[PDB]
Amino acid sequence: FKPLPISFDDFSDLNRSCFAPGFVFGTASSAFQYEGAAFEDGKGPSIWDTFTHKYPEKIKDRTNGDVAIDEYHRYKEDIGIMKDMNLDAYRFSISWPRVLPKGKLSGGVNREGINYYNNLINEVLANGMQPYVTLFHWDVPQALEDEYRGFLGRNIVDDFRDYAELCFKEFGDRVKHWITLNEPWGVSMNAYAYGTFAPGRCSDWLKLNCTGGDSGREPYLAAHYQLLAHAAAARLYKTKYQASQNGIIGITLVSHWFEPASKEKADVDAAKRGLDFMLGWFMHPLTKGRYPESMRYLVRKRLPKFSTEESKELTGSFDFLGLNYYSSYYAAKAPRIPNARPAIQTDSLINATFEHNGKPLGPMAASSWLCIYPQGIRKLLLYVKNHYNNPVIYITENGRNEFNDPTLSLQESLLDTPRIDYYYRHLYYVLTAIGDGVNVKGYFAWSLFDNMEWDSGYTVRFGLVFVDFKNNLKRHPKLSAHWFKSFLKK
Amino acid sequence: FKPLPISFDDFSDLNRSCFAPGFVFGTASSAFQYEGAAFEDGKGPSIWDTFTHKYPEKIKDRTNGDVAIDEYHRYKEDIGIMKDMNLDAYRFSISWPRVLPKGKLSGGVNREGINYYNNLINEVLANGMQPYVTLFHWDVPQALEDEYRGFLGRNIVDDFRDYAELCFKEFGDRVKHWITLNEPWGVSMNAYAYGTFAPGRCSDWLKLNCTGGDSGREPYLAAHYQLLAHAAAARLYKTKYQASQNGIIGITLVSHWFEPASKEKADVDAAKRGLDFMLGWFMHPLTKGRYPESMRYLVRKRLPKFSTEESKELTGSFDFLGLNYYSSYYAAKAPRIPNARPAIQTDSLINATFEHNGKPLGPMAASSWLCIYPQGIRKLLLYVKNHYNNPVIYITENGRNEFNDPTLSLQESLLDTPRIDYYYRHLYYVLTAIGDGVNVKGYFAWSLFDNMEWDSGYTVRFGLVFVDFKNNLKRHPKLSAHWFKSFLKK
Helix, strand or coil, X not given: CCCCCCCCCCHHHCCXXXXXXXXXXXXXCCHHHHCCCCCCCCCCCEHHHHHHHHCHHHCCCCCCCCCCCCHHHHHHHHHHHHHHCCCCEEEEECCHHHHCCCCCHHHCCCHHHHHXXXXXXXXXXXXXXXXXXXXXCCCCEHHHHHHHXXXXXXXXXXXXXXXXXXXXXXXXXXXXXXXXXXXXHHHHHHXXXXXXXXXXXXXXXXXXXXXXXXXXXXXXXXXXXXXXXXXXXXXXXXXXXXXXXXXXXXXXXXXXXXXXXXXCHHXXXXXXXXXXXXXXXXXXXXXXXCCCHHHHHHHHHHCCXXXXXXXXXXXXXXXXXXXXXXXXXXXXXXXXXXXXXXXXXXXXXXXXXXXXXXXXXXXXXXXXCCECCCHXXXXXHHHHHHHCXXXXXXXXXXXXXXXXXXXXXXXXXXXXXXXXXXXXXXHHHHHHHHHCCCCEEEEEECCCECXXXXXXXXXXXXXXXXXXXXXXXXXXXXXXXXXHHHHCCC | CCCCCCCCCCHHHCCHHHCCCCCEEEEECCHHHHCCCCCCCCXXXXXXXXXXXXXXXXXXXXXXXXXXXXXXXXXXXXHHHHHHCCCCEEEEECCHXXXXXCCCHHHCCCHHHHHHHHHHHHHHHHCCCEEEEEEECCCCEHHHHHHHCHHHCCCHHHHHHHHHHHHHHHHCXXXXXXXXXXXXXXXXXXXXXXXXXXXXCCCHHHCCCCCCCCCCCHHHHHHHHHHHHHHHHHHHHHHHHHXXXXXXXXXXXXXXXXXXXXXXXXXXXXXHHHHHHHXXXXXXHHHHXXXXXXXXXXXXXXXXXXXXXXXXXXXXXXXEXXXXXXXXXXXXXXXXXXXXXXXXXXXXXXXEECEECCEECXXXXXXXXCECCCHHHHHHHHHHHHHCCCCXXXXXXXXXXXXXXXXXXXXXXXXXXXXXXXXXXXXXXHHHHHHCCCCEEXXXXXXXXXXXXXXXXXXXXXXXXXXXCCCCCEEEECHHHHHHHHHCCC
8 A cells, every 4th residue: 555645635635626527427326216106117027126016025125117207208307317416327227127028039029118218218328428237136027936936947048139139239329338247146155045036046044034945955046047148248248239239248146255354264264265156256257267166166066157158258257347346355264063064154254244353343234244445445446456357447346325214304314424434435545446556437425326135125215315205206406416416526 | 413504514613613712622631641741840650651661562552651752841832722722721630649749748749740730731721712621631640549549448538638739829820720630531441341451350250360359349439539539629629628719629431422332222221221331420429419229220239339428418519510421332231141240331231232133333443442423412512401400511621533553645644524423413413402401611622632531542532733752742733723713813
């Protein structure tokens, strides 16, 4: 580490002029969290649609995404806010079942679905911003879940290649930045290892009230098919559409920073395994066509294998890496319990905590897994540069939350100084990583507006802009929106 | 609650123009934490001097206050920083054993000791600031501890009246704001109930490695004599010095906000008892000449009694209240354990926590008792106004800390955005209390510089200005110092 020649003599010294003139600043979202219109204009149901209405008790506040923040009908006002804030880009996702209601290409193409994304894309570009588009953001068409168990069936790869091709042909003339998948670790672990996400599967002996499953086998299956789906969509783009469209394609991975519990070799080795089982799971295959050695050694037979052809297709199939960072953990070696039933969470032999002898690594945000350690982003960034031959990186999500509290007045709800604290220190550490040679090209805040946080429902708020859910979903910019607008003003 | 007509459209909208033009903004400190020169220019030893060298294992990092930040020799530079920052006042304490080395007036007056405070007082006033002086800030002369057990002996009252008179005669011509005691709750509980502060006493059965004591009796004795000492000094000032000196005298009390765990009557009643045993302990006697009913009912015989004359002297003996606020707790009723040995901590029958069904009240700072809940200051302020007939209030301490971390570079150490967050929201809530009729006249931040935090040693940092303890105690203003200077600039 070696500091930055700045001199933070005023609070206003940290702004966009500190970054290269070409650095991209934007905000991110997903279709299920923002759009609304779940049954409208020919859209078919996703697994998240089904999960929330079938099992309301699996959602903290027993809510759903039928209306969400209604971006479907409010997109002009939303883009208007972005333009006023001086943003450079917008990262959003396309709903698979909105364009192809039955999943398969032979089920029919929803023309009205295609029209919505054309309107959104043209609005983004007309307001001096560039669209960064995510193909899959956890909303598997219900038809494919019913037919072959969605991402647990090999059938998903061919159907996902067809979906990607439809988006490339229809929107490819305007969209020059594509993202195939959004956080395959999250899907694998929360949908198949813990059971908190749709379809809510996990091993029965864990007593997490799951809908069937196996946490020692299914998470690995879901991750393997997700990687094959990515390779299919990425190879199609490069071989048939990249020479005429002139854009780039990548993938978004999520990772935490794992800090050794002590200086001991066992604790040093545990942190490394944490990174291998979270980040390495997806980056090894993407750069080398095989899983990390530690996963191969400790999972043995339960870890799927790539064919020769699958390895060739995967190796190097990305123009950039989309990195998502939020939290950090302390990692210590966990001893092998004799006769333990297999599960992905215990397979790595790590004890992950937020303290070392009762002393905290940092304070917590409203989500119980999010520990604030700004140094983690810089250390994660240097790990990617040094272990994965210095790829081009875009930070595709970064942020924190607060609790939804009905006793607070509007004025009180808009004074989000902890979020300002969070962005200031994380942005400082991104700048130090750039100083040390990391190829970071952009940064996207999660999120512009308050929204549904998956299984947590509307009990937490992640936005820069407050949404009044009791009065026609009114948009009320928080103090952090005004602060970010000033940061971006020259 | 009803908001403030402001409109926090920019971050710079919260400044000193939001407060009345006469509102006082300053910073606070104590003699043991800042001065240094512990054995120099005729000063005698305090109980804190003795405690740290005798028992280095009772201090987290095994440190002492011999040098501290050396304000004794560096006071001109320290006042210089304050003047550059646009502050209105400085709250500091006078060391009892520096002016009277043997405690008693018949032990001799240290002339050199008197000269230091004359130099400091004249420097404060010459730099356009007013001194707010604390007579006792936990540094009991060792001579009086040796002779009659300091604040556990009735002999302390007469000696404390003599000390106060010396300060009034010598410094009274320039000092118009006097504070008799600093946090008698802290002394009573930490020195006699838990054993963490000098002289480190507590009940042997608690297994806290104390130096002797009784937690069911001594804390009550120490608090009773502290109140008698205050009354003696306050009555002397008003009857003999106030008509010619034209100043005012008060006392500084510390209190947390106690939030009911649930809506249940038992939880509502537990929060009230929390306030009675912490704040009420000292405010009841000061306004009514008797302890709160709940303390009288649950402590019975172990609670000392005031004579008729002592009640008359105490009732109304303060011109203003010095209030110290830092943290908030959730309070729930605790059941009576059959056969429990008596202790002040269990006497109130309350279970105090920082969570309700695992959900946090707020995040924690570096000190394990400090939970961040900005609403607490406003609720505490309204409680004082409504229960204690609307006194004149000065907030004499408010702030947060971070850990001393040797792996961080200087630049990294100066980016104290969490402290900015802490002052912004607490200052907003002070403004709302003023709006609802509380008579708040000033606010003092704890503290300007990093210093020794009693039994925690130098493991935590509370300042707006970083002190480099490895390089001639160099002063390096943090981002929060620059932010506070801008807040105070018009």
